[PDB]
Design a protein around this ligand. Structure first.
Ligand SMILES: *C(=O)c1ccc(C(=O)O)c(-c2c3ccc(=O)cc-3oc3cc(O)ccc23)c1
Ligand SMILES: *C(=O)c1ccc(C(=O)O)c(-c2c3ccc(=O)cc-3oc3cc(O)ccc23)c1
Ligand SMILES: [Ca+2]
Ligand SMILES: [Ca+2]
Ligand SMILES: [Ca+2]
Ligand SMILES: [Ca+2]
Ligand SMILES: [Ca+2]
Ligand SMILES: [Ca+2]
Ligand SMILES: [K+]
Ligand SMILES: [K+]
Ligand SMILES: [N]
Ligand SMILES: [N]
Ligand code: NA
Ligand code: NA
Ligand code: NI
Ligand code: NI
Lengths: 18, 107, 89, 89, 107, 18
């Protein structure tokens, strides 16, 4: 498989929130 | 598609196999990471896989934002380390001269 | 035993780098010209469009005129992160 | 036995990084704000003048919002190369 | 001068102690590198130092432009690797939780 | 010592000439 439009949302909170 | 792109494809496809199972579909939680590691790093991480707590510290270490999941950005650090540790083992105790590879990790 | 496909993938990344590092000189050194051949042959357009010299300056962190294996892993990491984001377009 | 001064130097680089990585969060993660404190306290002016955010973008190779130890070693390598060139002025 | 700058100073001063002895004064040839390693990496490279041929492959590996000397740019790669391998040993077999350092390399 | 003006020439041929 060539991953195109995996269609679920990408995780994007690449930072500390603790 | 090049050899490198294919290898990159396999890292992404393997991450996605376990990230979608529970919780956030684009991240690996503790249980999904344990499963990926048990199955698809079964040779490279043979010794670590015998100690569930070692596997837990590894995940804690990779989880750079401390949100208890591995993003893909966090995960590819483990792939780079294992690739680097495999190449190191190919050259372990090297006496030279020139270039030669012994068997890598998990071999 | 037989390696998993993921493990074979990681070893193959080693193999890829050495196609270019073993062309000449130091066996773990990819010189500027070798790096252009690597980018053009192994990477997609949205990676190559950066230019092989801009990549060389980025990857040669110790400015010794070569990309060693750990410096090449910087390239691999950036390509993986980019490939992953593209898979969500 | 007792370590040489060179060996103590290398271990001390580990120690330096952890002053900032152990401030909060992941124990091997230096977040953007910690990295400004690191640069301002540990690096000379000709390193700092780059700006802590330009350094953060350079060092965070996997763009996960943190500088881990191997990424911090990129900073250490660049400072060493720079310090060496300056010693020939 | 900060702790990091001082450590950087010590790497540069140690390189210069052996680079000036023969040939190019700003580079380490095989003999100067063997001397630096025998004395000032006597603990970190204890095991490698027992095999002059291992020391020769290390130098061959660091000599990225294949001119048979180590520039300072080539040498600081060995310092980064040994620093990284020391931190790895501090965390070898780590089970967690949290952060703790065992003794490093050469200990 | 704080290495300033070490006064011998710095090696600068950081490239392959073999
Ligand atoms: C995605 O399209 C995909 C999924 C699985 C495979 C596979 O494991 O074989 C591939 C893939 C090939 C697909 C078709 C084909 O004719 C030949 C293929 O060769 C390979 C070779 C490797 O090493 C990995 C993947 C494939 C593609
Ligand atoms: C260069 O100026 C230099 C050379 C040697 C030393 C040393 O090994 O002690 C230092 C240096 C100091 C110099 C003077 C002083 O009063 C205190 C010093 O403390 C240290 C501490 C460490 O860890 C390394 C070097 C010095 C300076
Ligand atoms: Ca998940
Ligand atoms: Ca995380
Ligand atoms: Ca380099
Ligand atoms: Ca990072
Ligand atoms: Ca010399
Ligand atoms: Ca050289
Ligand atoms: K994804
Ligand atoms: K010098
Ligand atoms: N927090
Ligand atoms: N050459
Ligand atoms: Na080469
Ligand atoms: Na931290
Ligand atoms: Ni090799
Ligand atoms: Ni640590």
């Amino acid at each position: 498989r060539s991953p195109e439009s995996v269609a679920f949302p990408m995780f994007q909170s690449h930072w500390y929130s603790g | 598609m090049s050899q490198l792109e294919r290898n990159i494809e396999t890292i992404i496809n393997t991450f996605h196999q376990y990230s979608v199972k529970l919780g956030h579909p684009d991240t690996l939680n503790q249980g999904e990471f344990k499963e990926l590691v048990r199955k698809d790093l079964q040779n490279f991480l043979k010794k670590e896989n015998k100690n569930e707590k070692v596997i837990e510290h590894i995940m804690e270490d990779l989880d750079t934002n401390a949100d208890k999941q591995l993003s893909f950005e966090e995960f590819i650090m483990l792939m780079a380390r294992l690739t680097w540790a495999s190449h190191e083992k190919m050259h372990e105790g090297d006496e030279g001269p020139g270039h030669h590879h012994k068997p890598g990790l998990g071999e | 035993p037989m390696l998993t496909e993921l493990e074979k993938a990681l070893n193959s990344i080693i193999d890829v780098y050495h196609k270019y590092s073993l062309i000449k000189g130091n066996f773990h050194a990819v010189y500027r010209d070798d790096l252009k051949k690597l980018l053009e042959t192994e990477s997609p357009q949205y990676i190559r469009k950066k230019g092989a010299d801009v990549w060389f300056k980025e990857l040669d962190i110790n400015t010794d005129g070569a990309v060693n294996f750990q410096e090449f892993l910087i390239l691999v990491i950036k390509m993986g992160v980019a490939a992953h984001k593209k898979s969500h377009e």
